[PDB]
C-alpha cells in the first residue's frame, strides 16, 4: 500500500532502535521487534518488505540508520519552484537552516537557457516535463509573470500540490482544500507606504 | 513647513473622531500638538476650513495625502526583481559595476553616499545579505526613514515607531507547512 498500520509502526521501530543502539546492542531479532511494537513476527516480516529493509536477526546499526533515513524522507518538505527569473533565482540561492527540513528540490522554467541549468545546486527543468518529475512534493513557489500563473496552478493541483506560495500579482482560483499564501510584493510595498500616511492598514 | 504640521493635525484628529467629537478649537489643538493656535488658524484657512468641523479636516487631510519617495538598497536578484516589478527613486549598492548605472529606470549610487542623497524619503527596501542588514538599518533610522521593507532573514533592531515589513521565504514556508501537517 503501504498500509496505514504499517506506516504508523515506522516511528515506533525507530524509537525502539535508538534505545537499543544507545544501550550497546548489536543484534535484534523479529521476536524482540515484535515485543517492542506489540505485534507478531509475521507482521515484522510483512512491514519490513513494505519498508525495503534487509535482514537474516537484524543488525541494530543498519536498521537504525535505515529507519532514520526513511523517517527523514517521510518528514522532509520538498518544495518546487516554477519560474527561474530574478525572484526565482534568489530563492534558489536561499540558505535554509539545518534544523529546518525544508528545501527546494527542483525548479521549472520555459527559457531554453534556464532549462538544463543548476541554480544554487537545484536542477531547472523544462516546464513541459512538470508531470514526469512531480510525485510526492506538496508545496510550490510561483514566481512567473501573472499571465502564466493560473494554467500552471491548474496543473500543480492536478499533480497533488496542496500548498502554494504565490509571489505573482495574479489572484489564483483553486479548490477549497488548497492553501494559498499570496505575497504580492508591489502590494506589500504600497501597504507600508499607506500605513505611514494614514496609520491604518491598506485594503486588501 | 505647512505639510509637516498636517500629519500632526491628522493623527490627533483621527484620535478625536474615534471619541465622537466633531468640533475642535485652535486652543484645543494647540494644547494637544504643541503648535501655537495662531499658526493653526493660519493653516486651517489654507485647508479651506471654516471651532472647526473635525470631519471636514480629516477628509481633507486624507485626500491631500492620497493626492501627492522609496529607496532601495541591494540591487541583486531580489532588488532587481523589485525594480521590475508607488515609485522607487534611488537604489544603493557596493558593487562598482552597478554603481553609476540604471536598473529599471532607477539610478544606482554608492552606499557611502546614502547620507548625502537621502533627504525626504521615508521608506527603504532592504534586499542585501542578512550580514549587511543591521548596520544599514542603523544608518537609515539615523537618516529618519519611517518604514523598512525587510526582504532579508535578519531580525532588525529598530525603535518601536519604525514600521518593519518582514518578507522571508523560510518564515513564510514554515507557516504554510504547519497548516498542511496539522489541518489537512
Ligand atoms: O522578471 P524576471 O526576469 O525575474 O522573471 P519573470 O517575472 O519574467 O518570470 C520568472 C521566470 O519565469 C519564466 N517563465 C515565464 N513564463 C513561464 C511559464 N509559463 N512557466 C515557467 N516559467 C516561466 C521566465 O523565463 C523567468 O525565468
Ligand atoms: O546574488 P545577488 O546578486 O542577488 O547578490 P547578494 O544576494 O549577495 O546581494 C544582493 C545585492 O546586494 C548587494 N550588496 C551586498 N552587500 C551590500 C551592502 N553591504 N550594501 C549595499 N549593497 C550590498 C550586492 O552587491 C547585490 O547587488
Swiss-Prot record, chain A:
The keyword Cell cycle does not apply. InterPro entries: CoA-bd (IPR003781), NAD(P)-bd_dom_sf (IPR036291), Rex_DNA-bd_C_dom (IPR009718), Tscrpt_rep_Rex (IPR022876), WH-like_DNA-bd_sf (IPR036388), WH_DNA-bd_sf (IPR036390). One of its GO terms (cellular component) is cytoplasm. Residues 12-51 bind DNA. Its main location: cytoplasm. NAD(+) binds at residues 83-88. SUPFAM superfamilies: NAD(P)-binding Rossmann-fold domains, Winged helix' DNA-binding domain. GO terms for molecular function: DNA binding; DNA-binding transcription factor activity. One of its GO terms (biological process) is negative regulation of DNA-templated transcription. It comes from the Bacteria. It is found in: Cytoplasm. The keyword Secreted does not apply. Keywords: Cytoplasm, DNA-binding, NAD, Repressor, Transcription, Transcription regulation. It holds the Pfam family CoA_binding. Belongs to the transcriptional regulatory Rex family. Modulates transcription in response to changes in cellular NADH/NAD(+) redox state. Homodimer. This is Redox-sensing transcriptional repressor Rex. It comes from Bacillus subtilis (strain 168).
From Swiss-Prot, chain B:
Keywords: Cytoplasm, DNA-binding, NAD, Repressor, Transcription, Transcription regulation. Modulates transcription in response to changes in cellular NADH/NAD(+) redox state. HAMAP family: Rex. This is Redox-sensing transcriptional repressor Rex. GO terms for molecular function: DNA binding; DNA-binding transcription factor activity. One of its GO terms (cellular component) is cytoplasm. Homodimer. Belongs to the transcriptional regulatory Rex family. PANTHER family: REDOX-SENSING TRANSCRIPTIONAL REPRESSOR REX, REDOX-SENSING TRANSCRIPTIONAL REPRESSOR REX 1. It is found in: Cytoplasm. NAD(+) binds at residues 74-79. The keyword Zinc does not apply. GO terms for biological process: negative regulation of DNA-templated transcription; response to redox state. InterPro entries: CoA-bd, NAD(P)-bd_dom_sf, Rex_DNA-bd_C_dom, Tscrpt_rep_Rex, WH-like_DNA-bd_sf, WH_DNA-bd_sf. Residues 8-47 bind DNA. NCBIfam families: PRK05472.1-3, PRK05472.1-5, PRK05472.2-3, PRK05472.2-4, PRK05472.2-5.
